[PDB]
Every structure is written in C-alpha cells, then in structure tokens.
Write an enzyme that holds these catalytic residues in place. Structure first.
Site, PDB file in Angstrom:
ATOM      1  CG  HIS A 218      -0.603   0.320   2.487  1.00  0.00           C
ATOM      2  ND1 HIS A 218      -0.654  -0.579   3.540  1.00  0.00           N
ATOM      3  CD2 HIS A 218      -0.145   1.479   3.003  1.00  0.00           C
ATOM      4  CE1 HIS A 218      -0.211   0.009   4.634  1.00  0.00           C
ATOM      5  NE2 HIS A 218       0.119   1.267   4.333  1.00  0.00           N
TER       6      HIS A 218
ATOM      7  N   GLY B 235       2.190   6.424   9.707  1.00  0.00           N
ATOM      8  CA  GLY B 235       3.608   6.242   9.346  1.00  0.00           C
ATOM      9  C   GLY B 235       4.272   5.072  10.069  1.00  0.00           C
TER      10      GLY B 235
ATOM     11  CB  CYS C 178       2.424   1.307   7.417  1.00  0.00           C
ATOM     12  SG  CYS C 178       0.843   2.135   7.751  1.00  0.00           S
TER      13      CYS C 178
HETATM   14  O1  LIG Z   1      -0.961   5.381   8.216  1.00  0.00           O
HETATM   15  C1  LIG Z   1      -1.815   4.576   7.915  1.00  0.00           C
HETATM   16  N1  LIG Z   1      -2.308   4.324   6.667  1.00  0.00           N
HETATM   17  C2  LIG Z   1      -3.253   3.222   6.616  1.00  0.00           C
HETATM   18  C3  LIG Z   1      -4.569   3.394   5.813  1.00  0.00           C
HETATM   19  C4  LIG Z   1      -4.339   2.024   5.144  1.00  0.00           C
HETATM   20  C5  LIG Z   1      -4.425   1.891   3.647  1.00  0.00           C
HETATM   21  C6  LIG Z   1      -5.113   0.844   3.056  1.00  0.00           C
HETATM   22  C7  LIG Z   1      -5.174   0.717   1.672  1.00  0.00           C
HETATM   23  C8  LIG Z   1      -4.537   1.627   0.861  1.00  0.00           C
HETATM   24  C9  LIG Z   1      -3.834   2.662   1.433  1.00  0.00           C
HETATM   25  C10 LIG Z   1      -3.777   2.792   2.816  1.00  0.00           C
HETATM   26  C11 LIG Z   1      -2.916   1.994   5.744  1.00  0.00           C
HETATM   27  C12 LIG Z   1      -3.386   2.961   8.090  1.00  0.00           C
HETATM   28  O2  LIG Z   1      -4.177   2.199   8.610  1.00  0.00           O
HETATM   29  N2  LIG Z   1      -2.478   3.731   8.809  1.00  0.00           N
HETATM   30  C13 LIG Z   1      -2.243   3.583  10.219  1.00  0.00           C
HETATM   31  C14 LIG Z   1      -1.583   2.462  10.709  1.00  0.00           C
HETATM   32  N3  LIG Z   1      -1.368   2.275  12.014  1.00  0.00           N
HETATM   33  C15 LIG Z   1      -1.814   3.177  12.868  1.00  0.00           C
HETATM   34  C16 LIG Z   1      -2.523   4.344  12.510  1.00  0.00           C
HETATM   35  C17 LIG Z   1      -2.989   5.290  13.447  1.00  0.00           C
HETATM   36  C18 LIG Z   1      -3.655   6.401  13.019  1.00  0.00           C
HETATM   37  C19 LIG Z   1      -3.885   6.620  11.651  1.00  0.00           C
HETATM   38  C20 LIG Z   1      -3.452   5.716  10.723  1.00  0.00           C
HETATM   39  C21 LIG Z   1      -2.748   4.559  11.128  1.00  0.00           C
END
Ligand SMILES: O=C1N[C@]2(C[C@@H](c3ccccc3)C2)C(=O)N1c1cncc2ccccc12
Ligand SMILES: O=C1N[C@]2(C[C@@H](c3ccccc3)C2)C(=O)N1c1cncc2ccccc12
Lengths: 304, 304
Positions: free
Chosen positions: A41, A143, A145
């Site tokens: 992703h 961030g 991820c």
């Molecule tokens: O930064 C991202 N981005 C995605 C959104 C998700 C995604 C799915 C499909 C395509 C693109 C993106 C991946 C996510 O879930 N997070 C977070 C991770 N862990 C903790 C988080 C805490 C707050 C906000 C986002 C978080």
C-alpha cells in the site's frame, strides 16, 4: 522476583529498519541481505484507498520510483516484485547488519515483540500477542506501517508480523513476511469485521503459575475440576477451550509449583465466577492473557 | 491509536553490556569508552554479605583479579577504583560501540527503560518508574545485578539506574551511575524498610489524558474541583500531592483534549471515591501511574 511485560532486546532489528518512499507516501521497510520488505500500500495515493488495483498501480512504477533510505545512506533499487501484500525491493547492497533470521507464521495466542518505527527510525519496543481473532492491540500512529514483530532464539531473529492497517475499531492488522494477512483482513480502506475475540486460557493459566512463583497465592482454593467441567465455564466467559496439548505445555510450571493443572483450572473457574473482589494478582485487577507458558518459564529462568 | 507500556529501543545499550567476574561472583557491567562500571558487591563472598567492609575487601584485590568479558573478547584491566557503591575498572580498549551518553540522577515518579542482563548478555527490555519511595518494581533474577536503566533523547543515552539489590519484600533497589543509592538503601544483606509508597498523581492524570485521546471517556463527569479540595482526597488515598508545576506540565495534554486539568482532577476524585465499578480504562481495571506526561505526549506524537 517480580513479573513484567518484557520485550526482546531490539538491537538486531534496529539495524534492519529503513525508510521507503513511493511518490508522497513514506513508511518503514525491513532490510535483510539485498532485499527490502514493506507493505504494498506504499504505492497507493489518496485516490486509491477504497479499492486499490495493486497490479495496475505497480505496473505504473519502475525501480527508480522507490526511494529506500537507511539513515543518511540512499540504496539503489535494481528489482521489484509484489508477493501477496508486501513489496520486495532488490537493492545493490547487502545489509552489513543483517542478523541470522527466519520468517515464521505464528499462531493465535502466541506473543512477539514490536519495534514501532516512523520514517525508518525506531521509536519504541513493546510485547504483545496475536489475538485469537488475528488482530493485535498495539500502539501505532500514521507512518508506523511496516513496523515488524519478532522473537529471538539465542542469535536468530524470527520475524512474524508486519504492520499494515489500523481498523475503524482502533485495533491493528498486518501480515507475515510473505505478505499473507493474519485473519480475514485486506489492504483496502473499508469497515472490516475482526469478530469475537476470546481470552487465551492457556496464557491466563501460565500467568497464575507466574503469580504463585512470585508469592501471590490468595486465589488458590480447596477445589479441583475436570477438563469438561472447566471448558463449560470457559465457553460461558468467552475463554478459548483448554486441550490436553495446553495441559501438556503447562507441565514444567505444574512441576515447579507442585500445583496440578486442573487444580489451577479450578482456581481460574472461581475467579471467573466470583471476580477478583477488588484484590490484585501481579499488580493487575484483571486476568492477563499475553504471557505464554514459554514467556513465564523464560522470565522465571533468565534466558539470555 | 492504542496505548502500551513502551520501552526505548535497546540497541545502543546492548553494545555496552559486559560480564564482570571477581573470584566466583559474576554480574553485568557497562562498558563506555575505556571504563567498565559495575556494582562493588562483585568483590563479596558468601562470608561477607551481612556487613562487608568494601575498602578492606577491595584492598585484597589487584587489576588481574577482575575478569571483564565482552562476548568472546577478554578485556585487560589497567586500573580500578571504588566510587560510592560502583567499581570503575579502566580497561586498555575504548568500546567501539560507545553511544553518545550522559549520567543522570532521575527524580521519583520519572520513568526509564531497563535492559535485564545475565552474564553480560541481554535477556529483555521493559519500562518502569522510580517509585516515590525510590524502589522499582522490576523483573530481576540472581545475576541480573549491574543491569541498567536509561532514557534516549534522539542519539544520546541517559543512564539513570544500576541494579544492585532485591529487598526481602521482593522489590528492587540500585544506584545512579556515580554509585549513590536511590533511597535509604545500603549494599548489605539486611532487612531494609522501603517505607510507604504513594501513587504518582501527575502520571495517573497523564494516563487519563491518554485514555480520552484514545476514546475511553466514560469517567468524564459533570464536576470540577480545586487544587486544595483535590489534594485533601489525594492524601486520603496515598496519592502524591499535586502542585502548580504538575498542572503546568499537563498543559499540552489539556490543550490537545480541551479538558482543564482541574476537571480531569474531579474525574480522578470520583474514580478514587467510587472505584472503577468493574469497568476498564485502556484495558486496565486500576489507575496506572507509570506514564509521565512526556511519555504520553511522545507515544501520542510518535517521537523517533
Ligand atoms: O498510516 C496509515 N495508513 C493506513 C490506511 C491504510 C491503507 C489501506 C489501503 C490503501 C492505502 C492505505 C494503511 C493505516 O491504517 N495507517 C495507520 C496504521 N497504524 C496506525 C494508525 C494510526 C492512526 C492513523 C493511521 C494509522
Ligand atoms: O543476585 C543477587 N545478589 C544480591 C544479594 C546482594 C548483596 C549485598 C551485599 C553483598 C553481597 C550481595 C546482591 C541480590 O539482591 N541479588 C538479586 C538481585 N536481583 C534480583 C534477585 C532475584 C533473586 C535472588 C537474588 C536477586
């Protein structure tokens, strides 16, 4: 004495954490030998997240679109492929800090250490468990991820988890290092049912053994029970059913404390039926299920 | 989202852990530049522990009686001195892995990470707090002595704690890296009163802010209170008195949540008077006091 939620020392994994950028998106990658692993992703934009076509998105990308940075040092990307939900970027340089490592798919109820990272720099380390419903209750911000979970056996790192998603319910989903999700989750920004989480019964019992070893004994009662009778109570309270495999792995703790497994089960039953009554066990007012029997033995024997 | 007892990544400290042997006694030492630091009780035998004369014991020791091993590599000891309750062994070789570091004497209620070690090899990392009575509730076995506590600010390690003693009550006492004990403790095998431990009020309030940020809001009530009224309740329940310094450091969390400090104090008061009623906050059935306001902000902002 004392009993703590203890993580593995993170040194061997810190030396593997890199930053991966594709367009605007930055997240963490894992640099082992001449391959960098990260969530696929990373190739998504604001426009793509509801239902990305990852094959189609990847096809618009070349080696030079992936910016891989280890501290100051930029890496040169000489190959890319998609394996399930991870990208594998082949770089020209082998990680000099690569530890002895394996990739392992862990089972629900097992524990591992998480090195929480941002922009390829380590922020914190904590211990957690694969929940029975294949989620993890972590501490992850935007961030994080590509942050990884691992175990260490002597000098060998077993990587078991890569962080991909926070679910709308605030819990965390990710993959093994071959890019297969734990649980029914997909890497799409949709509402996804985790489903009913249970308590890890074998782990609660391990922690009761830990308590007895450390001098907390008040919950020991005059009763015993049967595996059938116990499991009837387990089911009522959304506890995982206990098997003879579970009883078997509790043998060392049974032997160290001189308490039969089913006597400990009878104590647990009364705690479930009567609660803690405002008392505490190892400084906690609820039953803890994030120590395996292995973790309790390790922490109580001092494995290094 | 989510909130965990998170430790600092331990890599920078793993590269400093050595084994120190004097006669039969082995424990951990900290190798920074060309000096190894360890508890002075390494020079004690079975015969000495009730009331060691450390000056007299040290006088029967020469450079070559101290065996310092970093993994396989033996170090050559070319000088030794006793500073309060630590031995400083000068070795011929500077630690190539020495990080940027300071020595700090922390204050009661502050938190740090512990790398628990045995025979100079790291076993585990966890987060903990200097209790108001200068003890720590750790996880330490025989041979953990010389295990260190630290904080990391960017690339700089602040070593604050060296483990010396488990007390007859199962709690842990140690020194700063200049060998002064935290609290009234001495390095003699006697019964030593730790005294009355209180709850770290400012830390409980920080954790209530952490809870609100992460969506647990049930304990927010219609009331407010005064610093005087609150402190009258704090005293009753063996909570540290709250000062304007405490209120001041909670400012950032007050600003992020839009909850005034004294409104949060009024919620705490009702929790102390009425208990949790079988409810939970951030997966805990008791009030947690091992997060500083700094720790909560760090974990909620992702400092790396
Ligand atoms: O930064 C991202 N981005 C995605 C959104 C998700 C995604 C799915 C499909 C395509 C693109 C993106 C991946 C996510 O879930 N997070 C977070 C991770 N862990 C903790 C988080 C805490 C707050 C906000 C986002 C978080
Ligand atoms: O291994 C030792 N040895 C001393 C006994 C104590 C001592 C004091 C004066 C002179 C010699 C020795 C230092 C100790 O307190 N521990 C432990 C540390 N942490 C945790 C422990 C857990 C179990 C047993 C001993 C422990």
């Amino acid at each position: 004495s004392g009993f703590r939620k203890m993580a593995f020392p993170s040194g061997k994994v810190e030396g593997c954490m890199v930053q991966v950028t594709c367009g605007t998106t930055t997240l963490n990658g894992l640099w082992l030998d001449d391959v960098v692993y990260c969530p696929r992703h990373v190739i998504c934009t604001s426009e793509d997240m509801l239902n990305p076509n990852y094959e189609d998105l990847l096809i618009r990308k070349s080696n030079h679109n992936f910016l891989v940075q280890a501290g100051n040092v930029q890496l040169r990307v000489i190959g890319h492929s998609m394996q399930n939900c991870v990208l594998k970027l082949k770089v020209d340089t082998a990680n000099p800090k690569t530890p002895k490592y394996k990739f392992v798919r862990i089972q629900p109820g097992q524990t591992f250490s998480v090195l929480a990272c941002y922009n390829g720099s380590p922020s914190g380390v904590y211990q957690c468990a694969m929940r029975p419903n294949f989620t993890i209750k972590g501490s992850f911000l935007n961030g994080s991820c590509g942050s990884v979970g691992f175990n260490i056996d002597y000098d060998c790192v077993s990587f078991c988890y890569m962080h991909h998603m926070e679910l709308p319910t605030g819990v965390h989903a990710g993959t093994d290092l071959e890019g297969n999700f734990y649980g029914p989750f997909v890497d799409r920004q949709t509402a996804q049912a985790a489903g009913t989480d249970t308590t890890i019964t074998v782990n609660v019992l391990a922690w009761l053994y830990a308590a007895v070893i450390n001098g907390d004994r008040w919950f020991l009662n005059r009763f015993t029970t049967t595996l059938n009778d116990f499991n009837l109570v387990a089911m009522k309270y959304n506890y995982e059913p206990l098997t003879q495999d579970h009883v078997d792995i509790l043998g060392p703790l049974s032997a160290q404390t001189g308490i039969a497994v089913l006597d400990m089960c009878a104590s647990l039953k009364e705690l479930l039926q009567n609660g803690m009554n405002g008392r505490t066990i190892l400084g906690s007012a609820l039953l803890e299920d994030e120590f395996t029997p292995f973790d309790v033995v390790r922490q109580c024997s001092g494995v290094t």
